[PDB]
Amino acid sequence: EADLTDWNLPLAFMKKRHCEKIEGSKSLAQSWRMKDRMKTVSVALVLCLNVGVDPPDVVKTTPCARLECWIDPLSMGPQKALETIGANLQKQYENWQPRARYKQSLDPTVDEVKKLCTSLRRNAKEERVLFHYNGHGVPRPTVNGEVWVFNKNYTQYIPLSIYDLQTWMGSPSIFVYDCSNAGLIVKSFKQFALQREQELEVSMKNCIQLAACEATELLPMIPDLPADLFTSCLTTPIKIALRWFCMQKCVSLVPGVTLDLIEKIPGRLNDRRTPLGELNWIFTAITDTIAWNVLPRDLFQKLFRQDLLVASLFRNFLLAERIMRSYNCTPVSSPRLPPTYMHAMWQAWDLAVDICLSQLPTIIEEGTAFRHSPFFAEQLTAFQVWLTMGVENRNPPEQLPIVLQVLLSQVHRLRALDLLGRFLDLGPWAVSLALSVGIFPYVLKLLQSSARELRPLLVFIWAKILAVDSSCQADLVKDNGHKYFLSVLADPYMPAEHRTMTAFILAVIVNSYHTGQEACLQGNLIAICLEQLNDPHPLLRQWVAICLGRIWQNFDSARWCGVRDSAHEKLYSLLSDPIPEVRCAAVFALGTFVGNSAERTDHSTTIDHNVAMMLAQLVSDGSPMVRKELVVALSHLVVQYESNFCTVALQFISVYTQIWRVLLHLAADPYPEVSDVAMKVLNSIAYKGFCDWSARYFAQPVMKIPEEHDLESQIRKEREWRFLRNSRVRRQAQQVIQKGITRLDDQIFLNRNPGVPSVVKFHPFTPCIAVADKDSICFWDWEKGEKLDYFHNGNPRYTRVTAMEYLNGQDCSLLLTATDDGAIRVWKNFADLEKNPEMVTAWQGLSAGMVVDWEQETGLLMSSGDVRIVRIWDTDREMKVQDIPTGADSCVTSLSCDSHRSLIVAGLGDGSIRVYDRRMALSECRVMTYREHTAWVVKASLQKRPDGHIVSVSVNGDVRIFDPRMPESVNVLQIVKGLTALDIHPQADLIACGSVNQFTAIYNSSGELINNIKYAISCLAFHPHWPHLAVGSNDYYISVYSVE
Amino acid sequence: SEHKEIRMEAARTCSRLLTPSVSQTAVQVVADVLSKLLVVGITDPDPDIRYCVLASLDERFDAHLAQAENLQALFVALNDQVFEIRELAICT
């Protein structure tokens, strides 16, 4: 089952390639941080009507458009009713905003106009004035933008002073022109504004304008219309829409409806549960949706998000565009809008009305409890579909402005909040899109609700926002909402993920600035954070320790609880942590605990000294990141220990010097960045971050599905074709042994390679024979018989590259190199000369003789040398974790750590052979000792086998074979008595002898011999399956031997 | 492959070869061909190709047919010169 064996075969440093790639970003528009709040001043209501006096331009007919604000003056008290309409119109505007004033201005002459406009403008200059007009009992506007009222005499022509109004309205304002040629007023306003420019050459028009028709047009006279139609739309859209609707079609698919019933829809145009609330509420959603769809991006916020009475009547403008184009009108706007009348969302409106008014012919009479509209259910479903494929970031989904209404609506909030969660869990565009749509104020407000439902919802959403967003600035902590988080930091009633997010959110609140460290005192965050050290989830333990380490920022009043309730000592339980990310997170927090203590000394010197000695312990790690974070926790102590360090530094030319001793340990490290990190921190004293990795994760999508179950997933397709290949290789490479051994009748190659015999390794299925210079990783090709290249291991030339291993064999051909001084270094990408290699990790493992045994077999690395011990290395702790001694005192010179009998052999520096049951107590490891060697053990092949026999050679000059259950050397080959190179390969059962002659000597485990062939040599090895030989030889050279 | 009969059976190929196929990776491969096929259904000036391309769709792809961009391609098809294409379109 080869591709299952290939993945079952473990691999090394898999996560370690991820972390250092700490992400950065730049600030958006993020204009949900919206500034400008010029509201309205007041409404001018220059209600020029001269009631009953026909402007002589017009001739009426009996079927006449007559109503205004749904009052008829012809059937009312004439000169009295002229007041009533002004109050009525104000009261309609008060529905759209009452927090601004009103003057009801009836047939005003220029003096009256001057008084009205200038007095109101004088009360507030930068604020928006509302110019509002009606052109009745008043002829059509002049070519030069003028009017027709004086002392209500006879529709008397008057210049409107419009070019003076142009500075009265020069600062922000809005204008409405209800008249028979309003586009002429707008055009001429441009000619006067251009005359203002033709002075300003020594705010051209920011101010808003709404025109009841274009210049060429003239108003309708159909009696079924309210006469003030443009205003009636801008003021009462629902009455218009319903009263338009009911006339339009030419077969009434619901037939019961009449004008009479649409007057009597129940509700009060301000209650969503009532039908008369529902149609408005739907209309409110539709208009935004078109706006987001069809406008260029900024213009939407500029008109529909900056200000209320700007936006609100603007929504009605689209409804006006529809009815007006039904008739012969084309109303027009200050800004240069694109058209809208056609858009598909209008048909969603018309269906929603038909559904509603199907019922009303009974509800009016039969006490029918009405059926609520399905509009929102239908809408969220469509969005849910686009998420459920979720297949892109292209043409982003237009339902987005509908979502905002359900974030408020309790009746349906849950579903919407989840869907929004999934959307926010997508990549940063979706976050940016929600933010710039103006999701923020809802997501700000709604944490007012301590409903447990917000834990998987608004809290998760907050987490993902903050994962990218630095601009949220403990806002809900200077506001009330934070009380939510203070529960779900510690609240156990859900999985630790929910605490992980909250620990991150509170770790963000302390990341932001001192507002979080104040919030620590406003809720005792230290104590409840320490309670979370105990939960099993490692990334919670990380976020808890990064929380406390940010709590101990320069806000020393927080460190008072960290001292006075023993946080720093209690936290040492996460120095007893196997997880190097959690270990680092605690190491960081103790770093800032001492470091940021406002240069406080005295009793803190004694206590923080214990923190320093406790930190000094964790030098144990092959981990590059613990090796950095240890030195960085010490540079954090130095944040106030630089107040003492100058004299302490001189002692190597107590506890300050234990920090110094640890810094002096890491400054030599074979990973250049770890030697650098310690070197630069020693040097800065001599002259006198990880949390961003935690942040760099949290943006990643969670709901999106891991790959390997998909047959089209490329990781799987590479594995499945390329590694399954090795069934045939693992057979074929051993088939000459299966078929029985034959003469060594051929050679692939004899020539130079740039490496010394201090290391030789054969790569099993792929061509790199590694033979390396004493400072090197260097290579030649066994498949084709060809030069590959030299590269540098980086160890200094008084040391020696002494061993090599591969952290698989076939797939990810990661390689380890080891050095006589110990130096362990791990390497990639040279493996098929694709590109330039790099070092994935290195550490000074083993700090006479050095030896290595990597187990692909089990997922463990082992090595021995001057430490008088076989180190056993674990990549899960990233540490030396188990330790087997020399037994005698002469350090090990050849070894095998078997895991098929589970044994060690240590061929020693005194030439004795130690055999170990590695289950025995570590002071007692000897199962056997042998002493038929007494100089130095050059070869110690304890075969990792069911017949786990020992072949061994020593500087005494002899070969012998030994059995681990016998106190003796049992049998003999000695084909040459003893010699400068030998191998005994455990899957070929062959031996090769480093003949001093020009022909290499070759023999068998049976004591039999085979044909000797051309090249004293210092190293050789057989292939891991093939009965073929690589000879790393002597004098920067290789020769290779086979059957043919 | 402007030669008429190639185009007809190449449609009837791509359809059935897709029919046999959670993870994004396969679904992306479905989507990729599916739209590039659908283009032809409205596009082709050889009218019976327009017919056969539509005829090749079924419930066997309903999830991607519930996608809005495709609903536009359907609506575009829903109005046509050829009565039978319209008769087929309404069913979907």
From Swiss-Prot, chain A:
<dbReference type="GO" id="GO:0031931">
    <property type="term" value="C:TORC1 complex"/>
</dbReference>
<protein>
    <recommendedName>
        <fullName>Regulatory-associated protein of mTOR</fullName>
    </recommendedName>
</protein>
<dbReference type="InterPro" id="IPR036322">
    <property type="entry name" value="WD40_repeat_dom_sf"/>
</dbReference>
<dbReference type="GO" id="GO:0010507">
    <property type="term" value="P:negative regulation of autophagy"/>
</dbReference>
<feature type="modified residue" description="N6-acetyllysine">
    <location>
        <position position="828"/>
    </location>
</feature>
<dbReference type="GO" id="GO:0043025">
    <property type="term" value="C:neuronal cell body"/>
</dbReference>
<feature type="modified residue" description="Phosphoserine">
    <location>
        <position position="713"/>
    </location>
</feature>
<keyword id="KW-0458">Lysosome</keyword>
<keyword id="KW-0945">Host-virus interaction</keyword>
<keyword id="KW-0325">Glycoprotein</keyword>
<dbReference type="GO" id="GO:0019901">
    <property type="term" value="F:protein kinase binding"/>
</dbReference>
<dbReference type="GO" id="GO:0005764">
    <property type="term" value="C:lysosome"/>
</dbReference>
<keyword id="KW-0472">Membrane</keyword>
<feature type="modified residue" description="Phosphoserine">
    <location>
        <position position="684"/>
    </location>
</feature>
<dbReference type="GO" id="GO:0001558">
    <property type="term" value="P:regulation of cell growth"/>
</dbReference>
<keyword id="KW-0597">Phosphoprotein</keyword>
<feature type="repeat" description="WD 1">
    <location>
        <begin position="751"/>
        <end position="792"/>
    </location>
</feature>
<dbReference type="GO" id="GO:0044877">
    <property type="term" value="F:protein-containing complex binding"/>
</dbReference>
<feature type="repeat" description="WD 6">
    <location>
        <begin position="974"/>
        <end position="1014"/>
    </location>
</feature>
<dbReference type="Pfam" id="PF00400">
    <property type="entry name" value="WD40"/>
</dbReference>
<dbReference type="GO" id="GO:0006974">
    <property type="term" value="P:DNA damage response"/>
</dbReference>
<dbReference type="GO" id="GO:0030291">
    <property type="term" value="F:protein serine/threonine kinase inhibitor activity"/>
</dbReference>
Curated annotation (Swiss-Prot), chain B:
<protein>
    <recommendedName>
        <fullName>Serine/threonine-protein kinase mTOR</fullName>
    </recommendedName>
</protein>
<feature type="repeat" description="HEAT 16">
    <location>
        <begin position="22"/>
        <end position="61"/>
    </location>
</feature>
<comment type="subunit">
    <text>Part of the mechanistic target of rapamycin complex 1 (mTORC1) which contains MTOR, MLST8 and RPTOR. The mTORC1 complex is a 1 Md obligate dimer of two stoichiometric heterotetramers with overall dimensions of 290 A x 210 A x 135 A. It has a rhomboid shape and a central cavity, the dimeric interfaces are formed by interlocking interactions between the two MTOR and the two RPTOR subunits.</text>
</comment>
<feature type="repeat" description="HEAT 17">
    <location>
        <begin position="64"/>
        <end position="92"/>
    </location>
</feature>
<comment type="function">
    <text>Serine/threonine protein kinase which is a central regulator of cellular metabolism, growth and survival in response to hormones, growth factors, nutrients, energy and stress signals. MTOR directly or indirectly regulates the phosphorylation of at least 800 proteins. Functions as part of 2 structurally and functionally distinct signaling complexes mTORC1 and mTORC2 (mTOR complex 1 and 2).</text>
</comment>
<comment type="similarity">
    <text>Belongs to the PI3/PI4-kinase family.</text>
</comment>
